[PDB]
Write a protein that binds this ligand. Structure first.
Ligand code: HEM
Ligand code: HEM
Ligand code: CXW
Ligand code: CXW
Ligand code: H4B
Ligand code: H4B
Ligand code: ZN
Lengths: 411, 407
């Protein structure tokens, strides 16, 4: 079968056949679309087909499908599964798999970059101190003094589900949030609960508006351990505005390295529960979401106040005005400090070129419109007008529950 | 089977039960989500009629009453005898209000129960259709104090006698492709404008020429009519701070009035059912003015603001966009023509959703359409999970008549 997608701005029509390799479910049915829902221990039995499908994909990619090396590797993995109940990826397969999870990540607008990913193999890691060291090296390598490089670090896979590696932080670098007795929040409200866990674990909180959180790391199903990332490794950007000299006095800054640490990488049926990965920011993630979401830093009011906008009626579009200026400030600040960042016009145009290339060479590019369209100025970006098909390919990145909810405390 | 939706800003969780009454299909499967696709007999009609009359009699608290059983029988007899049936005025009004209520792509549905329904089922000619439509236009406009309305022409019979309005909206601007290669007026209407002139329209060849109505009665060839200019309320566009704004010579019409859709009530199909409300500001300022394939005025505006257009990262498009949208709202508000901003409309829709969840067990909603085309995440709808499903009565898309009609 063939599915068609249309761009309503260009009338360019693309044909998808890759959706025929989709295995996992969407959450949608013929009767309900769950396209805007945010979140919609394996047997040998379920494991060998998944291994086989993956190795068939790996061997086709290298143009060795059905070769002796392909056949020997299937047999070898087969034997490893029956005997040990799991199996180990070759380094080449791990790299391919991690690149493909990114390539297949339908919520990611940055995927033009998928084939340039530095993979750090941390599968020999055994302790939380070992994890800390790996994660420092990743941060320093990725940061590269502002010339950011995409990277992923991959800790040992799940075994019985009792011995999981996890990074408890949702991202490697984030700011503490503190709920005050009066109900206000100091710092980042998204991180209150986690900040509270860190404090309970023994973290001494400076209690400011931009305190980089400690890493809380769990190796081999053990209780998690606290580490402070060396501050010389945490690149930050003070935020100022090119025309508005009072903007600096808002006291804003942000970190340069966006690094998701709570997701699960599935490759060939294997589950890598700790696999922090990082790229560089699109300006709107900070200027729109981190700064202006009402449940985050929520700076719209204070900015529009200082711009002397008419704030008595929403129809003055004061919020929209303050929003644009903040996003100008973020991009200006990162560029001035030579820290890599991409604006939403550039990122979306690049994504459209990526998606078109993928249709020609791959037969498709699964894409989640709800996530791909930027959270400001949607329709003046080319992605708004692009029809997309969302389906699930493996290798893949997946959500997993927060570890404080499932962890068996040892003491 | 019971489904939850969460608002990620407020943590409010709602439980949807209404989806289990979903009739039609979404286009999605368990393998593939088509959420962002624009367009994804006697025997058949009685189930549809019964489904509808059941929900109608339920709504007036008369479910299972003799009058309920009697109507079901009467309709049954009429279908077996005539191969269709006719709706009571009460059923027609309820059906039309419910098609709007069910419109998952509409942010304005808090209004759904205040719809003036004009019953035009006795209409027989295009001139009659023109009369009905001028009266709708005038009623709805109400000197700028806009009132929601729908006008319902006769239902489909054998499908060879369709009533259609060929216009996509009652009021739109002409589009003409030039020897220059560029486009004068609205590029969306080039083909429709080339159907008008071909049937004999006196095209003035300007940038903002209100198109003529092209009306088809009883499956006949369509005829041209000009809406009395004093019935087409238009707004010159100016900015409250930028004096030069007026010099772009921009204007828009006050009445948004979709005229190409099909109203389905109880299996009956109303192929000509123009309806209207009032604008949300972004429809004009973001979409009409700034789409690359529309009036596409961003470049001109950014220039008069003297912004740096050398690099996308100065956000010049974004800056101009906000100002263009400030101007649209200010102009409509100054000329006292009803308009809603995207902040107000989306806050009202959140209130509406909560009402529908509380009183009806859900509210079908298409997030892709409901989130405004600018400033998405600063409106509350951005953070609201929505379930999309199809309920009847409904408005549906239908083929453009020129591809279907035989002359
Ligand atoms: C290179 C620069 C990159 C840019 C500009 C970029 C951009 C983005 C943005 C804007 C999002 C949406 C995030 C949000 O709204 O919360 C996202 C999501 C995502 N990206 Fe990227 N990305 C980049 C690199 C990467 C890398 C290196 C990976 C992994 C190897 C990755 C995998 C993902 C995944 C799995 C998501 C979905 C996350 C979720 O559902 O929470 N991306 N990307
Ligand atoms: C009262 C003021 C109203 C407001 C502010 C409003 C708002 C909107 C908006 C912004 C859209 C998206 C349009 C687009 O982007 O193309 C829309 C779509 C729609 N509305 Fe409304 N609406 C109103 C009244 C009505 C009425 C009176 C009806 C029918 C009786 C209706 C039925 C629909 C339908 C069926 C769609 C989807 C049309 C399509 O798929 O192209 N709306 N609404
Ligand atoms: C590798 C990478 C690069 C990039 N530019 N952005 C990202 C995403 C990071 C930085 N900005 C937002 C953050 O993503 C956080 C995870 N996604 C949001 C999310 C997912 C599930 C549930 C709740 C959520 O808030 C990752
Ligand atoms: C009753 C009503 C009120 C309102 N405020 N807006 C509307 C929608 C009107 C005003 N702006 C766009 C117009 O709807 C056009 C049709 N919708 C978009 C569409 C659908 C299918 C195919 C192509 C399209 O462009 C209707
Ligand atoms: C309910 C809705 O799906 C949710 O708010 C989504 C919308 N789109 C998004 N898009 C991105 N990129 N990131 C997000 O967090 C969200 N949030
Ligand atoms: C391809 C995509 O579905 C298309 O551009 C949609 C997106 N969301 C929309 N939302 C609204 N309200 N109106 C539209 O015309 C569109 N167009
Ligand atoms: Zn879907």
């Amino acid at each position: 079968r063939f599915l068609k997608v249309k761009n309503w701005e260009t009338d360019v029509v693309l044909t998808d056949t890759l959706h025929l390799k989709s295995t996992l479910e969407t959450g949608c049915t013929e009767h309900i679309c769950m396209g805007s829902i945010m979140l919609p221990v394996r047997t040998k039995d379920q494991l060998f087909p998944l291994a086989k499908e993956f190795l068939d994909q790996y061997y086709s990619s290298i143009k060795r499908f059905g070769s002796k090396a392909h056949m020997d590797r299937l047999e070898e993995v087969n034997k490893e599964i029956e005997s040990t109940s799991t199996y180990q990826l070759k380094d080449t397969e791990l790299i391919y798999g991690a690149k493909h999870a990114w390539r297949n990540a339908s919520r990611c607008v940055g995927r033009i970059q998928w084939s340039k990913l530095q993979v750090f193999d941390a599968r020999d890691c055994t302790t939380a101190h070992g994890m800390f060291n790996y994660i420092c090296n990743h941060v320093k390598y990725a940061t590269n003094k502002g010339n950011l490089r995409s990277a992923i670090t991959i800790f040992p896979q799940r075994t019985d589900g009792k011995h999981d590696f996890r990074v408890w932080n949702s991202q490697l670098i984030r700011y503490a949030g503190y709920k005050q007795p009066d109900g206000s929040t100091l710092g980042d409200p998204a991180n209150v609960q986690f900040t509270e866990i860190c404090i309970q674990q023994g973290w001494k909180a400076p209690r400011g508006r931009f305190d980089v959180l400690p890493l809380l790391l769990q190796a081999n199903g053990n209780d998690p351990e606290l580490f402070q990332i060396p501050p010389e490794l945490v690149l930050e950007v003070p935020i100022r505005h090119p025309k508005f000299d009072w903007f600096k006095d808002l006291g804003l800054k942000w970190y340069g390295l966006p690094a998701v640490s709570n997701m699960l990488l599935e490759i060939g049926g294997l589950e890598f529960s700790a696999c922090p990965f990082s790229g560089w920011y699109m300006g709107t993630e900070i200027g729109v979401r981190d700064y202006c979401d009402n449940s985050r830093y929520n700076i719209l009011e204070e900015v529009a106040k200082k711009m002397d906008l008419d704030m008595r009626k929403t129809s003055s579009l004061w919020k929209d005005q303050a929003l644009v200026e903040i996003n100008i400030a973020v991009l200006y600040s990162f560029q001035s400090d030579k820290v890599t960042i991409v604006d939403h016009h550039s990122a979306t145009e690049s994504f459209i070129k990526h998606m078109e290339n993928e249709y020609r060479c791959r037969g498709g590019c699964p894409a989640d419109w709800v996530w791909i369209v930027p959270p400001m100025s949607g329709s003046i970006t080319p992605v708004f007008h692009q029809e997309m098909l969302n389906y699930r390919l493996t290798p893949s990145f997946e959500y997993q529950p927060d570890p404080w909810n499932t962890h068996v405390w040892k003491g």
